[PDB]
Every structure is written in C-alpha cells, then in structure tokens.
Amino acid sequence: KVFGRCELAAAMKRHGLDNYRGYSLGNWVCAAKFESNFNTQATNRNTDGSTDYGILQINSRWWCNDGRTPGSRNLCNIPCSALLSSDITASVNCAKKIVSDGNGMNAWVAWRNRCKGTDVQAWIRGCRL
Ligand SMILES: [Cl-]
Ligand SMILES: [Cl-]
Ligand SMILES: [Cl-]
Ligand SMILES: [Cl-]
Ligand SMILES: [Cl-]
Ligand code: NA
C-alpha cells in the first residue's frame, strides 16, 4: 500500500507514535517518507546481507526474521514479511522497540540525515488529526 501523507500520519497517531519516546508525529512521517516513500512494500538489501522492510525500513540484522541474515536476531518477534503489510501495526510496534533502545530515532540513518533538526511539523501540516 502506498499511503498518503495525512493518511499515514493518522494511522501512526492511532497506533500511538505521536510523541512516542518524545518524537513528534512529523518525525515519524518524515522518516517514513525518506525510508519508503510511504510504500509498505518497500525493501532494500544492505551490503552486509541484511534487508530493510516496510514503511520504516526495519532491518533484519536485529529486528525481524527473514531466514537469510546469518547471525541475526528477531527482537520484534516477527517475520520480516509482517512489516510489508498494508496494516502498519507490526511496523509501529517494532518501531517502538527500536526507538526505545538508547539511540532514539538516530537508529534510522535517513531520519538523522534528512529529518533531524528540520521543520518536521511540515510533514503533518494540513492533516485532520
Ligand atoms: Cl511534528
Ligand atoms: Cl536469519
Ligand atoms: Cl494501518
Ligand atoms: Cl510501548
Ligand atoms: Cl531520544
Ligand atoms: Na533477523
């Protein structure tokens, strides 16, 4: 599914991401934008053999099982495929574990390089939330 911007902001808010670990909604929307372009089916293979999955490009090295990342963990206790669903619940629940792990949203390199310190509220501007 390719979400609309305000559509995704609404689903993220419903699932409790607005101000989760102190990160305003626009942070999460901006991160999604630059990670996946709002496409729940996004995948990206990394050089290390791990893969990033879904709207927030969650990585198989730590967070989900794809059966093909030697030495990896599955800290969200999910098949990585669950992160490609049109329903964002698995992505959001797993995001919440990640962002709690000590580095906040810096865990998402694109958030650090493209969102951090920008006017992230622009990402939720106009949305009926
Ligand atoms: Cl915001
Ligand atoms: Cl594996
Ligand atoms: Cl959803
Ligand atoms: Cl939680
Ligand atoms: Cl933080
Ligand atoms: Na894994």
Swiss-Prot record:
GO BP of this protein: cell wall macromolecule catabolic process; defense response to bacterium; defense response to Gram-negative bacterium; defense response to Gram-positive bacterium; killing of cells of another organism
Predominant location: secreted
Positions of substrate binding: 101
Tissue: In the egg white and polymorphonuclear leukocytes.
One Pfam family it belongs to: Lys
EC number: 3.2.1.17
Domain C-type lysozyme residue range list: 1-129
Disulfide bonds, paired cysteine numbers: 6-127, 30-115, 64-80, 76-94
InterPro entries assigned: Glyco_hydro_22, Glyco_hydro_22_CS, Glyco_hydro_22_lys, Lysozyme-like_dom_sf
PROSITE patterns, alphabetized: GLYCOSYL_HYDROL_F22_1, GLYCOSYL_HYDROL_F22_2
Top-rank taxon: Eukaryota
Active site: 35, 52
Record's catalysed reaction(s): Hydrolysis of (1->4)-beta-linkages between N-acetylmuramic acid and N-acetyl-D-glucosamine residues in a peptidoglycan and between N-acetyl-D-glucosamine residues in chitodextrins
Localization in the cell: Secreted
GO cellular component, one term: endoplasmic reticulum
Keywords: Allergen, Antimicrobial, Bacteriolytic enzyme, Disulfide bond, Glycosidase, Hydrolase, Secreted, Signal
Function: Lysozymes have primarily a bacteriolytic function; those in tissues and body fluids are associated with the monocyte-macrophage system and enhance the activity of immunoagents. Has bacteriolytic activity against M.luteus.
Note: Lysozyme C is capable of both hydrolysis and transglycosylation; it also shows a slight esterase activity. It acts rapidly on both peptide-substituted and unsubstituted peptidoglycan, and slowly on chitin oligosaccharides.
Quaternary structure and interacting proteins, as annotated: Monomer.
Record-given protein name: Lysozyme C
Species the sequence originates in: Gallus gallus
Gene it is expressed from: LYZ
